[PDB]
């Protein structure tokens, strides 16, 4: 069953991956007296003790594996090794380890799947690059005891998923069950690598106890990697085979990437550009020189094509400014919309309000009204509730009266033709324009006073086709 | 003093780093009669002379160091060597060197500290990769004469701070004070590395003149480097272990990075995205197809979530367009704000202007006025002074008169209740609305004419509560 093998290999590679992470940190983030502190990894202090200083020297993958217990590191059951690679306070009391890492490299308790599995990490070798105490480790070999190509496929899959790869896989053997008895399995004096285990499986006696030695190369080499595990101090782009293009580097915050000019730029105007490569100009977001409201030196961003003409961005925009009434307070608003509209009462029955002093209206159901759906306000920063807003301004207004047939002729329903219907005008008293809202609708209503000097009769009109307004809608922190 | 040793090492590494940087440039930017031009490094012209063609042949770090003066390069006092690695016009008249580099690899005048320090660069070896004239150099060795573990610590610190690392450090000796007498210090026929000077210090006689040979490798090509000293032609990202993601490359300008679609994209809509990983959609700035005002093919940018809906950007926006009056001139504007407000004179004492023909207002101090703080305008590109603007449009107006109690009933202070007090209206003459400013304030005032037909009395009102306006505020290059 390979589904069980896959769990064992995922745990094994999880353990292997954590250990490599620990080796690959020369400075580790530790927790001394409640405040994170960076200290040198105990691996590279020539003052730390067993097992942090333990080193083997078989730099060659084909050299004889060590038989010294203070050179390799015995792992697993019966060993207190795990204490030295887990937090001091994996128990509430504190273990015998002296370090509280800011992060768990491996779980404090070994994965339960590995407690009785057929493949276990039995011993870990730290290959030293030189002969100084606390030297750098240039290869980590993991001896996994078998309690053979099925697991290698499974382990290779699990390592593929964890962004690690084996330098090589060797078959290792020992005559007993001691951690220092491990030697390389040999075919004619040549150590048997796993890739060559297909042809040499027959010349191996069942009298030995076998396992695999997985060799990794911890050092996260100074070069940027496909797995992205290299932090870049900066990165610059080439132009015509020279390092004269823009550069990206992080600022101190950890949140921001900063784009700066290259050495080849004759002008200092860095930009990010999008290109469809479909025959039109790329669009660039470029930083350019400016001046503030007090004529001091400043800068801004411009979205432009390759001709220097502004480009178009589709988005919701919020603008923040101090309230022009009370300063020291911020106000947010969106880009407004304008709709031209006139009211729609046309005949005398709907137009004339019979008893003005007594009339009590219902702007939700009055004839001739303007009705709109309440817009949805866009995203706003935390703690700034945006309210939908609406207002109306007078666009055209006349005091039209009944003609010889009791009909009203002045009509402003279409802006391109307001003067083409003239009407028979009286004296204007003015108009009262009101804006109300329910949960879903904006309601706009109006009242106009007119004196007819022909009949000396006073009329009050409701939502007339003689009055048209320009309606402005937006969202704002300033309520309605 | 490790403080004095550190300055010597910083100078030493500065020289070393500059020299190595020059070695690492096969094409160099030179200046020929006013203009920068690319020419082949004289090191790799089989037509250049001493010392550009000088090459040693000890490829092995353990091989015999050359003893031929036309193979190694003597450095320092008594040598004209430095001329050939600095600009021709480090002096105003011109030196015997033949090249004006566009940049100083090493300072023209040697760091003054190196003129008399205990450690000096005595000789520089250019290890050739083959036996052709002007061949590539595969290692640069700096022989430093002592005029031994203290300075190695300092030099390694200085090389760490200057983004270089030593391939290896050897101990060298000479029987006298010639630059060609340098040979490798040996213990039992084995060249003495510095990592083995701890155990063999006693078997070294003080009758020799000793020094260190620092070996630096030349290029850091092909692979991008963590310290960012390697430029990228482009960079593309992986998806599912394939190079199918977007690509960034510099355009010709030196200012722009250009984002383009990946090979795995089924649509051509490249985007830059932000993600908080806090449960909401990432926000993307994506380039999409569009059409201009002549319906010709074009493009724009869209700020959208993963659902294709517009997202919100909080920023100040400037829009540029040609003046709708005088073409050939460009004008800037900001996103406006709208304020609904009514004037506030309510009682007859404040409302009525007794002798209108004689009245001279003081719009700064008149009762009932609308007063606002002059807004601050945002940043604009150089040479485009923005002026604050304010305008008013009529929202509601009626020709109210005194009621039976001498009070004025119509009130438009609240848009949602403009019709709630009808008042007793006369005939309207109109209104004059004025906007003025001091250094800090907008002053909005108004005058309304009303004829009362009940009393045949002519009225002029100042800043009445029955007149309301929509105040629009913005910034523009078009003045007030």
């Amino acid at each position: 069953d390979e589904a069980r093998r896959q769990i064992v290999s995922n745990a094994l590679i999880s353990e292997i991956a954590g250990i490599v992470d620990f080796v690959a940190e020369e400075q580790i983030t530790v927790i001394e007296q409640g405040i994170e502190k960076e200290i040198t990894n105990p691996l590279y202090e020539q003052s730390s003790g067993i097992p942090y200083i333990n080193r083997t020297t078989n730099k060659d993958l084909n050299s004889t594996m060590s038989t010294n217990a203070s050179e390799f590191i015995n792992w697993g059951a019966g060993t207190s090794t795990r204490i030295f690679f887990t937090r001091k306070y994996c128990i509430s009391t504190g273990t015998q380890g002296n370090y509280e890492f800011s992060k768990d490299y491996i779980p404090c308790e070994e994965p339960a799947i590995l407690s009785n599995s057929d493949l276990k990490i039995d011993r870990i070798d730290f290959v030293a690059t030189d002969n100084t105490v606390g030297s750098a480790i240039e290869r980590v070999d993991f001896i996994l005891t078998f309690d053979f190509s099925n697991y290698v496929s499974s382990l290779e899959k699990a390592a593929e998923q964890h962004s690690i790869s084996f330098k090589d896989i060797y078959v290792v053997e020992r005559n007993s069950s001691g951690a220092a008895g491990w030697r390389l399995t040999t075919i004619s004096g040549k150590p048997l690598t796993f890739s060559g285990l297909s042809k040499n499986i027959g010349s191996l006696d069942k009298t030995k106890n076998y396992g695999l030695r997985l060799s990794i190369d911890p050092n996260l080499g100074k070069f940027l990697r496909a797995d992205g595990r290299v932090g870049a101090d900066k990165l610059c782009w080439n132009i015509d085979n020279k390092m004269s293009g823009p550069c990206l580097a992080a600022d101190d915050s950890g949140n921001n990437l900063v784009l700066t000019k290259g050495k080849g730029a004759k002008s200092n105007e860095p930009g990010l550009c999008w290109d469809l490569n479909t025959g039109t100009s790329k669009l660039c977001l470029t930083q350019i020189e400016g001046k503030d409201n007090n004529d001091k030196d400043a800068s801004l961003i411009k979205l432009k094509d390759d001709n220097g003409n502004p480009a178009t961005m589709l988005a919701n925009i919020l603008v923040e400014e101090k309230s022009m009434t009370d300063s020291t307070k911020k106000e947010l608003r969106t880009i407004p919309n304008t709709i031209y509209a006139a009211f729609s009462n046309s005949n005398a029955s709907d137009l004339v309000i019979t008893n003005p002093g007594n009339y009590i209206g219902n702007v939700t159901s009055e004839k001739g009204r303007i009705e709109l759906n309440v817009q949805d306000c866009p995203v706003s920063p935390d703690g700034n509730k945006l309210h939908p807003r609406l207002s109306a301004s007078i666009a055209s207004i006349v005091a039209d009266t009944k003609d010889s047939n009791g009909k009203y002729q002045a009509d402003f329903s279409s802006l391109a033709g307001n003067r083409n219907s003239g009407g028979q005008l009286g004296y204007l008293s003015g108009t009262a324009i009101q804006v109300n809202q329910s949960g879903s609708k904006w309601y706009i209503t109006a009242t106009m006073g007119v004196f007819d000097p022909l009949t000396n009769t006073t009329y009050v009109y409701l939502n007339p086709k003689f009055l048209s307004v320009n309606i402005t809608t937006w969202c704002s922190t300033e309520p309605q | 003093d490790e403080a004095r040793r550190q300055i010597v090492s910083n100078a030493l590494i500065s020289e070393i780093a500059g020299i190595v940087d020059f070695v690492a440039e096969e094409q160099i930017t030179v200046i020929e009669q006013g203009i920068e031009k690319e020419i082949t490094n004289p090191l790799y012209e089989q037509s250049s002379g001493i010392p550009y063609i000088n090459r040693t042949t000890n490829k092995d770090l353990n091989s015999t160091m050359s003893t031929n003066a036309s193979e190694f390069i003597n450095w320092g006092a008594g040598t004209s060597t430095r001329i050939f690695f600095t600009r021709k016009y480090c002096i105003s008249t011109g030196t015997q060197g033949n090249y004006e580099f566009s940049k100083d690899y090493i300072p023209c005048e040697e760091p003054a500290i190196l003129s008399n320090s205990d450690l000096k660069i005595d000789r520089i070896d250019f290890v050739a990769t083959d036996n052709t004239v002007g061949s590539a150099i595969e290692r640069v060795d700096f022989i430093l004469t002592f005029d031994f573990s203290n300075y190695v610590s300092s030099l390694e610190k200085a090389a760490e701070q200057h983004s270089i690392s030593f391939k290896d450090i050897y101990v060298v000796e000479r029987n006298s004070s010639g630059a060609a007498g340098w040979r490798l210090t040996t213990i039992s026929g084995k060249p003495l590395t510095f990592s083995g000077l701890s155990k063999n210090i006693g078997s070294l006689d003080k009758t020799k003149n000793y020094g260190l040979r620092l070996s630096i490798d030349p290029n850091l090509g092909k692979f991008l480097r963590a310290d960012g000293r390697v430029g990228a032609d482009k960079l593309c990202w992986n998806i599912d272990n394939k190079m199918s993601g977007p690509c960034l490359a510099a355009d010709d300008s030196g200012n722009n990075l250009v984002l383009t679609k990946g090979k795995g994209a089924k649509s051509n809509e490249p985007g830059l995205c932000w993600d908080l990983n806090t449960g909401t959609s990432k926000l993307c700035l994506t380039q999409i197809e569009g059409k201009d005002n002549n319906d010709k093919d074009a493009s724009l940018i869209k700020l959208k979530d993963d659902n294709g809906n517009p997202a919100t950007m909080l920023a100040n926006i400037l829009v540029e367009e040609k003046s709708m009056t005088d073409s050939t001139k460009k004008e800037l504007r900001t996103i406006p704000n709208t304020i609904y407000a009514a004037f506030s004179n309510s009682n007859a004492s404040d409302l009525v202007i007794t002798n209108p023909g004689n009245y001279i207002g003081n719009v700064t101090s008149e009762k009932g006025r609308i007063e606002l703080n002059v807004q601050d305008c945002p940043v604009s590109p150089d040479g485009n002074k923005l002026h604050p603007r304010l305008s008013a449009s009529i929202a509601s107006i009626v020709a109210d008169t005194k009621d039976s109690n001498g009070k004025y009933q119509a009130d438009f202070s609240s848009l949602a209740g403009n019709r709630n007090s009808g008042g007793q209206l006369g005939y309207l003459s109109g209104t004059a609305i004025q906007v003025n400013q001091s250094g800090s304030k907008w002053y909005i005032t108004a005058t309304m004419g009303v004829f009362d037909p009940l009393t045949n009395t002519t009225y002029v009102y100042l800043n009445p509560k029955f007149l309301s306006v929509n105040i629009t505020t913005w910034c523009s290059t078009e003045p007030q």
């Binding site: 309000i353 003005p356 002093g357 009339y359 009590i360 209206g361 219902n362 702007v363 939700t364 009055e366 008293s429 009262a432 009101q434 109300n436 209503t445 009242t447 006073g449 004196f451 000396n456 006073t458 009050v460 409701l462 | 009626v398 008169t401 119509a410 949602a416 019709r419 709630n420 007090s421 009808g422 008042g423 007793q424 209206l425 006369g426 009362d452 037909p453 009940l454 045949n456």
Partner: peptide
Amino acid sequence: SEGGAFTVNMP
């Protein structure tokens, strides 16, 4: 909600 008219005068 509510909307109302207004009284006007006669000579």
